[PDB]
PDB file of C-alpha atoms in Angstrom:
ATOM      1  CA  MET A   1      -3.276  10.371  22.558  1.00  7.09           C
ATOM      2  CA  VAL A   2      -6.605   8.850  21.465  1.00  7.45           C
ATOM      3  CA  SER A   3      -5.358   5.246  20.839  1.00  4.09           C
ATOM      4  CA  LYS A   4      -2.626   3.201  22.450  1.00  3.66           C
ATOM      5  CA  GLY A   5      -1.240   2.117  19.062  1.00  4.59           C
ATOM      6  CA  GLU A   6      -0.899   5.843  17.940  1.00  4.09           C
ATOM      7  CA  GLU A   7       1.925   6.100  20.645  1.00  4.76           C
ATOM      8  CA  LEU A   8       4.052   3.568  18.657  1.00  4.61           C
ATOM      9  CA  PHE A   9       4.346   6.000  15.823  1.00  4.39           C
ATOM     10  CA  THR A  10       5.563   9.280  17.340  1.00  6.60           C
ATOM     11  CA  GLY A  11       9.141   8.682  16.023  1.00  8.98           C
ATOM     12  CA  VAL A  12      10.828   6.882  13.178  1.00  9.27           C
ATOM     13  CA  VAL A  13       9.796   3.286  13.029  1.00  7.43           C
ATOM     14  CA  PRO A  14      11.633   0.536  11.065  1.00  7.89           C
ATOM     15  CA  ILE A  15       9.752  -1.338   8.322  1.00  6.32           C
ATOM     16  CA  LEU A  16      10.066  -4.695   6.672  1.00  4.08           C
ATOM     17  CA  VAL A  17       7.946  -5.828   3.713  1.00  2.00           C
ATOM     18  CA  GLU A  18       7.741  -9.377   2.251  1.00  3.10           C
ATOM     19  CA  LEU A  19       5.652 -10.269  -0.688  1.00  3.11           C
ATOM     20  CA  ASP A  20       5.112 -13.588  -2.553  1.00  2.00           C
ATOM     21  CA  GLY A  21       3.249 -13.265  -5.880  1.00  2.00           C
ATOM     22  CA  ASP A  22       1.979 -15.291  -8.738  1.00  2.00           C
ATOM     23  CA  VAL A  23       0.621 -13.419 -11.871  1.00  2.00           C
ATOM     24  CA  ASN A  24      -0.648 -15.717 -14.687  1.00  2.00           C
ATOM     25  CA  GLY A  25       1.665 -18.378 -13.306  1.00  2.00           C
ATOM     26  CA  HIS A  26       4.688 -16.066 -13.221  1.00  2.15           C
ATOM     27  CA  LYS A  27       5.939 -16.322  -9.693  1.00  2.00           C
ATOM     28  CA  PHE A  28       8.091 -13.833  -7.814  1.00  2.00           C
ATOM     29  CA  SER A  29       9.035 -12.534  -4.391  1.00  2.00           C
ATOM     30  CA  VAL A  30       9.894  -9.074  -3.145  1.00  2.00           C
ATOM     31  CA  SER A  31      11.570  -8.033   0.098  1.00  2.00           C
ATOM     32  CA  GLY A  32      11.660  -4.382   1.334  1.00  2.74           C
ATOM     33  CA  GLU A  33      13.075  -2.350   4.137  1.00  5.52           C
ATOM     34  CA  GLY A  34      13.010   1.250   5.245  1.00  6.96           C
ATOM     35  CA  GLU A  35      11.398   3.387   7.793  1.00  7.88           C
ATOM     36  CA  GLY A  36       8.325   5.496   8.402  1.00 10.01           C
ATOM     37  CA  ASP A  37       7.757   8.819  10.199  1.00 13.87           C
ATOM     38  CA  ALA A  38       4.022   9.194  10.743  1.00 15.73           C
ATOM     39  CA  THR A  39       4.497  12.710  12.211  1.00 14.58           C
ATOM     40  CA  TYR A  40       5.189  13.795   8.657  1.00 15.29           C
ATOM     41  CA  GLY A  41       3.294  10.965   6.867  1.00 15.51           C
ATOM     42  CA  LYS A  42       6.527  10.005   5.270  1.00 17.26           C
ATOM     43  CA  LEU A  43       7.849   6.575   4.153  1.00 19.87           C
ATOM     44  CA  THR A  44      11.264   5.703   2.618  1.00 19.29           C
ATOM     45  CA  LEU A  45      11.541   2.131   1.311  1.00 18.35           C
ATOM     46  CA  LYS A  46      13.674  -0.020  -0.903  1.00 16.55           C
ATOM     47  CA  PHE A  47      12.446  -3.125  -2.446  1.00 15.36           C
ATOM     48  CA  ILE A  48      14.357  -5.977  -4.186  1.00 16.80           C
ATOM     49  CA  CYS A  49      12.911  -8.666  -6.388  1.00 18.06           C
ATOM     50  CA  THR A  50      14.559 -11.647  -4.599  1.00 16.84           C
ATOM     51  CA  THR A  51      13.685 -14.094  -7.461  1.00 17.64           C
ATOM     52  CA  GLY A  52      15.438 -12.249 -10.281  1.00 20.53           C
ATOM     53  CA  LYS A  53      13.428 -10.313 -12.832  1.00 23.01           C
ATOM     54  CA  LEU A  54      10.119  -8.960 -11.758  1.00 23.26           C
ATOM     55  CA  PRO A  55       7.507 -10.220 -14.326  1.00 19.69           C
ATOM     56  CA  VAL A  56       5.082  -7.170 -13.743  1.00 17.59           C
ATOM     57  CA  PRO A  57       5.972  -3.491 -13.601  1.00 18.95           C
ATOM     58  CA  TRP A  58       7.186  -2.128 -10.275  1.00 19.48           C
ATOM     59  CA  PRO A  59       4.560   0.609 -10.281  1.00 19.34           C
ATOM     60  CA  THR A  60       1.705  -1.899 -10.259  1.00 22.09           C
ATOM     61  CA  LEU A  61       3.002  -3.234  -6.913  1.00 22.15           C
ATOM     62  CA  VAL A  62       3.450   0.086  -5.042  1.00 22.17           C
ATOM     63  CA  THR A  63       0.014   0.070  -3.450  1.00 23.35           C
ATOM     64  CA  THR A  64       0.344  -3.502  -2.322  1.00 24.71           C
ATOM     65  CA  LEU A  65       3.845  -3.153  -0.943  1.00 24.04           C
ATOM     66  CA  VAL A  67       1.482   0.457   5.404  1.00 26.83           C
ATOM     67  CA  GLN A  68      -1.217   3.113   5.763  1.00 25.62           C
ATOM     68  CA  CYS A  69      -0.537   3.200   9.495  1.00 26.69           C
ATOM     69  CA  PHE A  70       2.133   5.785   8.663  1.00 29.00           C
ATOM     70  CA  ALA A  71      -0.453   8.366   7.475  1.00 26.17           C
ATOM     71  CA  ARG A  72      -0.252  11.772   9.023  1.00 24.28           C
ATOM     72  CA  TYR A  73      -3.668  12.548  10.609  1.00 24.38           C
ATOM     73  CA  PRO A  74      -4.249  16.175  11.490  1.00 28.04           C
ATOM     74  CA  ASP A  75      -4.922  16.939  15.171  1.00 27.31           C
ATOM     75  CA  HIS A  76      -8.582  17.470  14.544  1.00 26.85           C
ATOM     76  CA  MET A  77      -8.924  13.951  12.796  1.00 26.89           C
ATOM     77  CA  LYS A  78      -7.069  11.788  15.285  1.00 27.21           C
ATOM     78  CA  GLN A  79     -10.163   9.873  16.214  1.00 29.86           C
ATOM     79  CA  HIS A  80     -10.370   8.558  12.568  1.00 26.62           C
ATOM     80  CA  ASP A  81      -7.137   6.769  12.411  1.00 22.34           C
ATOM     81  CA  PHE A  82      -8.187   3.094  12.494  1.00 22.64           C
ATOM     82  CA  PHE A  83      -4.758   1.860  11.207  1.00 24.59           C
ATOM     83  CA  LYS A  84      -2.703   2.836  14.242  1.00 26.38           C
ATOM     84  CA  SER A  85      -5.500   1.971  16.625  1.00 23.93           C
ATOM     85  CA  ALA A  86      -5.235  -1.700  15.514  1.00 25.69           C
ATOM     86  CA  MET A  87      -1.472  -1.764  16.506  1.00 28.36           C
ATOM     87  CA  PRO A  88       0.575  -3.462  17.884  1.00 29.94           C
ATOM     88  CA  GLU A  89      -1.464  -6.661  17.100  1.00 27.46           C
ATOM     89  CA  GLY A  90      -2.150  -5.265  13.591  1.00 26.08           C
ATOM     90  CA  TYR A  91      -4.668  -5.661  10.770  1.00 27.96           C
ATOM     91  CA  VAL A  92      -5.392  -7.739   7.808  1.00 23.23           C
ATOM     92  CA  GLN A  93      -5.428  -5.742   4.539  1.00 22.96           C
ATOM     93  CA  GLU A  94      -7.184  -7.345   1.543  1.00 23.23           C
ATOM     94  CA  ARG A  95      -7.579  -5.959  -1.875  1.00 24.02           C
ATOM     95  CA  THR A  96      -8.871  -6.789  -5.386  1.00 24.39           C
ATOM     96  CA  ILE A  97      -7.210  -4.587  -7.876  1.00 22.48           C
ATOM     97  CA  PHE A  98      -8.867  -4.494 -11.389  1.00 18.46           C
ATOM     98  CA  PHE A  99      -6.692  -3.379 -14.258  1.00 17.66           C
ATOM     99  CA  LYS A 100      -9.062  -2.013 -16.792  1.00 18.93           C
ATOM    100  CA  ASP A 101      -9.189  -4.180 -19.919  1.00 22.09           C
ATOM    101  CA  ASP A 102      -6.726  -6.578 -18.310  1.00 26.10           C
ATOM    102  CA  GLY A 103      -6.350  -8.924 -15.350  1.00 22.07           C
ATOM    103  CA  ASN A 104      -6.685  -8.453 -11.663  1.00 27.65           C
ATOM    104  CA  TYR A 105      -4.623  -8.789  -8.524  1.00 27.93           C
ATOM    105  CA  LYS A 106      -6.018 -10.273  -5.310  1.00 28.40           C
ATOM    106  CA  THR A 107      -3.896  -9.479  -2.244  1.00 29.57           C
ATOM    107  CA  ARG A 108      -4.022 -10.506   1.438  1.00 30.20           C
ATOM    108  CA  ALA A 109      -1.601  -8.841   3.832  1.00 33.63           C
ATOM    109  CA  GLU A 110      -0.925  -8.806   7.540  1.00 32.57           C
ATOM    110  CA  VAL A 111       0.433  -5.565   8.942  1.00 31.40           C
ATOM    111  CA  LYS A 112       1.672  -5.747  12.549  1.00 29.56           C
ATOM    112  CA  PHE A 113       4.618  -5.094  14.905  1.00 29.59           C
ATOM    113  CA  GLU A 114       7.235  -7.853  15.226  1.00 28.09           C
ATOM    114  CA  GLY A 115       9.315  -6.427  18.050  1.00 27.31           C
ATOM    115  CA  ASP A 116      10.083  -2.804  17.208  1.00 26.45           C
ATOM    116  CA  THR A 117       9.528  -3.307  13.451  1.00 26.21           C
ATOM    117  CA  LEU A 118       6.374  -2.724  11.439  1.00 23.44           C
ATOM    118  CA  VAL A 119       6.084  -5.587   9.053  1.00 25.66           C
ATOM    119  CA  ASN A 120       3.882  -6.016   6.005  1.00 24.20           C
ATOM    120  CA  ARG A 121       3.630  -9.681   4.807  1.00 24.85           C
ATOM    121  CA  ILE A 122       1.691 -10.152   1.644  1.00 26.07           C
ATOM    122  CA  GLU A 123       0.421 -12.847  -0.720  1.00 27.57           C
ATOM    123  CA  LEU A 124      -0.615 -11.735  -4.180  1.00 27.88           C
ATOM    124  CA  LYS A 125      -2.379 -13.709  -7.027  1.00 31.70           C
ATOM    125  CA  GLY A 126      -2.977 -12.222 -10.403  1.00 34.51           C
ATOM    126  CA  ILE A 127      -5.077 -13.769 -13.072  1.00 36.24           C
ATOM    127  CA  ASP A 128      -6.528 -13.097 -16.562  1.00 41.49           C
ATOM    128  CA  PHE A 129      -3.730 -10.780 -17.702  1.00 43.87           C
ATOM    129  CA  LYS A 130      -2.917 -10.360 -21.341  1.00 46.79           C
ATOM    130  CA  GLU A 131       0.514 -11.669 -22.021  1.00 45.81           C
ATOM    131  CA  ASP A 132       0.995  -8.578 -24.339  1.00 46.25           C
ATOM    132  CA  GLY A 133      -0.934  -6.039 -22.254  1.00 43.38           C
ATOM    133  CA  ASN A 134       0.468  -3.074 -20.352  1.00 43.37           C
ATOM    134  CA  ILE A 135       1.298  -5.179 -17.321  1.00 43.50           C
ATOM    135  CA  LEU A 136       2.878  -8.415 -18.650  1.00 45.11           C
ATOM    136  CA  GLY A 137       4.148  -6.399 -21.558  1.00 44.99           C
ATOM    137  CA  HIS A 138       5.998  -3.829 -19.273  1.00 44.48           C
ATOM    138  CA  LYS A 139       4.607  -0.883 -21.038  1.00 41.83           C
ATOM    139  CA  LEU A 140       4.220   1.351 -17.918  1.00 44.06           C
ATOM    140  CA  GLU A 141       6.371   4.418 -17.006  1.00 41.71           C
ATOM    141  CA  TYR A 142       8.472   4.362 -13.872  1.00 42.03           C
ATOM    142  CA  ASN A 143       8.037   7.661 -12.062  1.00 39.05           C
ATOM    143  CA  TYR A 144       5.024   8.617  -9.764  1.00 40.19           C
ATOM    144  CA  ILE A 145       1.609   7.498  -8.585  1.00 38.54           C
ATOM    145  CA  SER A 146      -0.826   9.561  -6.599  1.00 40.43           C
ATOM    146  CA  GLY A 147      -4.391   9.328  -5.502  1.00 39.61           C
ATOM    147  CA  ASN A 148      -6.909   9.655  -2.777  1.00 42.55           C
ATOM    148  CA  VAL A 149      -7.808   6.575  -0.758  1.00 43.94           C
ATOM    149  CA  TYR A 150     -11.569   6.963   0.218  1.00 40.66           C
ATOM    150  CA  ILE A 151     -12.185   5.275   3.544  1.00 40.33           C
ATOM    151  CA  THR A 152     -15.423   4.389   5.238  1.00 43.27           C
ATOM    152  CA  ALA A 153     -16.180   2.349   8.469  1.00 42.73           C
ATOM    153  CA  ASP A 154     -17.192  -1.204   8.358  1.00 43.43           C
ATOM    154  CA  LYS A 155     -18.640  -1.578  11.854  1.00 45.75           C
ATOM    155  CA  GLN A 156     -19.766  -5.194  11.345  1.00 48.86           C
ATOM    156  CA  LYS A 157     -16.201  -6.255  10.845  1.00 49.43           C
ATOM    157  CA  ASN A 158     -14.828  -3.885  13.388  1.00 47.45           C
ATOM    158  CA  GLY A 159     -12.846  -2.452  10.461  1.00 50.02           C
ATOM    159  CA  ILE A 160     -12.776  -0.225   7.380  1.00 48.45           C
ATOM    160  CA  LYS A 161     -13.341  -0.444   3.678  1.00 46.78           C
ATOM    161  CA  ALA A 162     -11.595   1.712   1.009  1.00 47.92           C
ATOM    162  CA  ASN A 163     -11.742   2.280  -2.736  1.00 49.64           C
ATOM    163  CA  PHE A 164      -9.598   4.331  -5.063  1.00 48.86           C
ATOM    164  CA  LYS A 165      -8.561   4.555  -8.796  1.00 48.97           C
ATOM    165  CA  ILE A 166      -4.935   4.775  -9.868  1.00 50.87           C
ATOM    166  CA  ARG A 167      -3.764   6.076 -13.168  1.00 52.66           C
ATOM    167  CA  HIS A 168      -0.487   4.342 -14.323  1.00 51.00           C
ATOM    168  CA  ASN A 169       1.150   6.402 -17.137  1.00 50.23           C
ATOM    169  CA  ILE A 170       1.684   4.181 -20.370  1.00 50.03           C
ATOM    170  CA  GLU A 171       5.038   4.948 -21.970  1.00 50.32           C
ATOM    171  CA  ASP A 172       4.260   7.005 -25.129  1.00 50.12           C
ATOM    172  CA  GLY A 173       0.520   6.496 -24.446  1.00 50.63           C
ATOM    173  CA  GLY A 174      -2.341   7.250 -22.185  1.00 53.02           C
ATOM    174  CA  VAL A 175      -2.878   5.524 -18.719  1.00 54.52           C
ATOM    175  CA  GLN A 176      -3.683   2.026 -17.456  1.00 54.93           C
ATOM    176  CA  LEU A 177      -6.407   2.357 -14.822  1.00 57.86           C
ATOM    177  CA  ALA A 178      -6.107   0.283 -11.623  1.00 59.59           C
ATOM    178  CA  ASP A 179      -9.494   0.240  -9.661  1.00 56.11           C
ATOM    179  CA  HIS A 180      -8.747  -0.714  -6.076  1.00 57.80           C
ATOM    180  CA  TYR A 181     -11.142  -2.248  -3.503  1.00 57.78           C
ATOM    181  CA  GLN A 182      -9.831  -2.641  -0.007  1.00 59.62           C
ATOM    182  CA  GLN A 183     -10.918  -4.069   3.400  1.00 61.14           C
ATOM    183  CA  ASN A 184      -9.102  -3.910   6.688  1.00 61.45           C
ATOM    184  CA  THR A 185      -9.964  -5.856   9.736  1.00 66.04           C
ATOM    185  CA  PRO A 186      -8.033  -6.002  13.140  1.00 68.27           C
ATOM    186  CA  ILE A 187      -6.043  -9.094  14.115  1.00 65.82           C
ATOM    187  CA  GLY A 188      -6.454  -8.516  17.851  1.00 66.50           C
ATOM    188  CA  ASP A 189      -9.571  -8.302  19.984  1.00 66.17           C
ATOM    189  CA  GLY A 190      -8.972  -4.923  21.532  1.00 63.48           C
ATOM    190  CA  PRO A 191     -11.049  -1.771  20.688  1.00 64.01           C
ATOM    191  CA  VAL A 192     -10.266   0.111  17.550  1.00 66.70           C
ATOM    192  CA  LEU A 193     -11.212   3.497  16.124  1.00 65.40           C
ATOM    193  CA  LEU A 194     -13.949   3.361  13.511  1.00 66.06           C
ATOM    194  CA  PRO A 195     -13.767   6.394  11.373  1.00 66.71           C
ATOM    195  CA  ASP A 196     -16.058   8.912   9.683  1.00 64.79           C
ATOM    196  CA  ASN A 197     -15.664   9.053   5.938  1.00 60.49           C
ATOM    197  CA  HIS A 198     -12.343  10.632   4.942  1.00 61.90           C
ATOM    198  CA  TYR A 199      -9.501  10.020   2.603  1.00 59.96           C
ATOM    199  CA  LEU A 200      -5.704   9.564   2.485  1.00 61.19           C
ATOM    200  CA  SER A 201      -4.016  11.819  -0.022  1.00 62.79           C
ATOM    201  CA  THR A 202      -1.024   9.836  -1.122  1.00 66.35           C
ATOM    202  CA  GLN A 203       1.971  10.609  -3.479  1.00 67.53           C
ATOM    203  CA  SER A 204       4.589   8.014  -4.333  1.00 65.12           C
ATOM    204  CA  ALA A 205       7.901   8.760  -6.037  1.00 65.37           C
ATOM    205  CA  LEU A 206       9.740   6.000  -7.648  1.00 64.16           C
ATOM    206  CA  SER A 207      13.526   5.935  -8.262  1.00 62.83           C
ATOM    207  CA  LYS A 208      16.623   3.719  -8.599  1.00 66.17           C
ATOM    208  CA  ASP A 209      19.636   3.265  -6.401  1.00 68.76           C
ATOM    209  CA  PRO A 210      22.633   3.785  -8.787  1.00 69.25           C
ATOM    210  CA  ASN A 211      24.703   1.191  -6.952  1.00 70.23           C
ATOM    211  CA  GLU A 212      22.150  -1.544  -6.837  1.00 71.26           C
ATOM    212  CA  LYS A 213      22.487  -4.197  -9.546  1.00 69.64           C
ATOM    213  CA  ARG A 214      19.339  -6.289  -8.531  1.00 69.83           C
ATOM    214  CA  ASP A 215      15.892  -5.488  -9.868  1.00 68.55           C
ATOM    215  CA  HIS A 216      14.643  -3.011  -7.370  1.00 68.31           C
ATOM    216  CA  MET A 217      12.552   0.017  -6.509  1.00 66.58           C
ATOM    217  CA  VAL A 218      13.286   2.937  -4.124  1.00 67.16           C
ATOM    218  CA  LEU A 219      10.134   4.630  -2.970  1.00 68.61           C
ATOM    219  CA  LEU A 220       9.583   7.934  -1.248  1.00 68.32           C
ATOM    220  CA  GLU A 221       5.945   8.462  -0.243  1.00 68.39           C
ATOM    221  CA  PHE A 222       3.767  10.838   1.655  1.00 65.71           C
ATOM    222  CA  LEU A 223       0.431  10.011   2.885  1.00 68.39           C
ATOM    223  CA  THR A 224      -1.960  12.585   4.683  1.00 69.03           C
ATOM    224  CA  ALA A 225      -5.344  12.143   6.004  1.00 67.53           C
ATOM    225  CA  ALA A 226      -7.967  14.810   4.742  1.00 69.34           C
ATOM    226  CA  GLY A 227     -11.608  15.406   3.993  1.00 69.24           C
ATOM    227  CA  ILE A 228     -12.890  16.416   7.441  1.00 70.38           C
ATOM    228  CA  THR A 229     -12.954  20.156   7.912  1.00 68.88           C
ATOM    229  CA  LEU A 230     -11.468  21.927  10.930  1.00 69.15           C
TER     230      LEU A 230
END
């Protein structure tokens, strides 16, 4: 295989996620667990708001809450930066601009801790409208999809990405979330720097009928594309 880190993803890998957030002074924490199967680009994850009631909509946190689980086609294996950075991992940083509203800034470390892939995140949101679609909880709970457009950042030995998410508004249009992303390796080893390509990503959100805590079940597929065979 073309990276050493790729070999860590040939089977089902356990995942843990931990997020601490503060949006307009509304603090919260989220814990998640599940597993990923990069052979199929498939993630199954369950998240709990460990602080009680989540003060923002769950859909707005999906993208923050492990792109190393993407399925890369055989002809694109040399473009998978994410797995190439493993096991030492990478820092993933975003600004997420919610059109006509506030923004999230996120910093995450994604790395193996033993046999488990762990995503640990800090999130800060500012300038939200207390009666906007976010703090007003006006968003639908169902699905998100989009293309993550990736480019190499050779000077940081990493990558950049950008994408736009449409969050359906209940009885309305959509709330746009414009994402800007950077990823840099934690370790000093060589990584794969990709040609331009994208991750086609689909997220399905549901509830566990036996779970009384504020929570989200996520089934997600992520597939690399955009380089022809």
